[PDB]
């Protein structure tokens, strides 16, 4: 599956970084699971995960730094409370969970740059 | 979340092993995802996954050895084509996916014992 997202995004002084994550849905999917994987220092870190039902708003799995809202066949993710050390490649994994068949999409990733104020 | 399932189940000569997996649903959940995790030799193996929907019959994710039918707030799982080497602890992970909030349940696990005929 094809998954497109911004190549680079700058985090604000507060430490908030928003980025879109659109996917070319082949079938008429109802359930979609968007998962944010942070890749840095040759290790993967599952930042957050959310389930998007087509006719309803995006819901994130319990407590995470991620917020956002869905719109058709794309999601506007918003990562909060970022610092300098969090700077890495934020890969956007999409999965069409229901109905069958199962489709997997992994984007190139959004390199979110962060710096600490004073 | 509380998830109950048989402690031990014996697989038939053909290699079929059925077991129930009931869960104490706190809220009025419509979508529920039952996942069979086989734990053996200090490693987890995702055997299969089924999405219970309100208005539909239990639907397994693409092709698996698992079949079964839902009945209210429980599922009767049926694992087929098992052999001696498959013998392990079949843990039954339940997730209330929709509507919010998200609930996770993981049972103690059903130790399925299997024997090869001659």
């Amino acid at each position, epitope marked *: 599956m094809h998954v497109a997202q911004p190549a680079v995004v700058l985090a604000s002084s507060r430490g908030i970084a928003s980025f879109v994550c659109e996917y070319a849905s082949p079938g008429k999917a109802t359930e979609v699971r968007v998962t944010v994987l*942070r890749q840095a220092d040759s290790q993967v870190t*599952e930042v957050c995960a959310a389930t998007y039902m087509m006719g309803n708003e995006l819901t994130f799995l*319990d*407590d995470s*730094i991620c917020t956002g809202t869905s719109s058709g066949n794309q999601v506007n993710l918003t990562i*909060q409370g970022l*610092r300098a050390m*969090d700077t890495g490649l934020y890969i956007c994994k999409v999965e069409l969970m229901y109905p069958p068949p199962y489709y997997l999409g992994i984007g190139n990733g959004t390199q979110i740059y962060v710096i600490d104020p004073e | *979340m509380h998830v109950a399932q048989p402690a031990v189940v014996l697989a038939s000569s053909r290699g079929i092993a059925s077991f129930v997996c009931e869960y104490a649903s706190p809220g009025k959940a419509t979508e529920v995802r039952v996942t069979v995790l086989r734990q053996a030799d200090s490693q987890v193996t995702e055997v299969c996954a089924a999405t219970y929907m309100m208005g539909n019959e239990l639907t397994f994710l693409d092709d698996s050895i698992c079949t079964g039918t839902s009945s209210g707030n429980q599922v009767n799982l049926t694992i087929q084509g098992l052999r001696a080497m498959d013998t392990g602890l079949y843990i039954c992970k339940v997730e209330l996916m929709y509507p919010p909030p998200y609930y*996770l349940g993981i049972g103690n696990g059903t130790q399925i014992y299997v024997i090869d005929p001659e």
Partner: nanobody
Amino acid sequence: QVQLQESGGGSVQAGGSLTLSCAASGYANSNTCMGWFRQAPGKERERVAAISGVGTGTYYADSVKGRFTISRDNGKNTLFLQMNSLKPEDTAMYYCAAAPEGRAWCSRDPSGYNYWGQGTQVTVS
């Protein structure tokens, strides 16, 4: 494998203060959610607090909201629970937990934590 060991627990007077430590060891990925759970005599383990594996993100129970604080040292080796304004209801067996290595986001149910510490008792008069 990851191994957690608690310390700094004990009995104190009501309206007092304590600081629980949980020295975490043997991490492949140190960007993992850690949390604190307490178990009263008979009742099940409820989550008091939990911190995100990535960035600053603390999450608390309403029962201890404002009075308790969860924090991590620079190296992410030791997890702390700053306990202030201790009430008799806070009396329980406190456990420090960790999510599966790599899982930054924090489960509310204790079923979503793989690694646990032996536990430490906290009594409040």
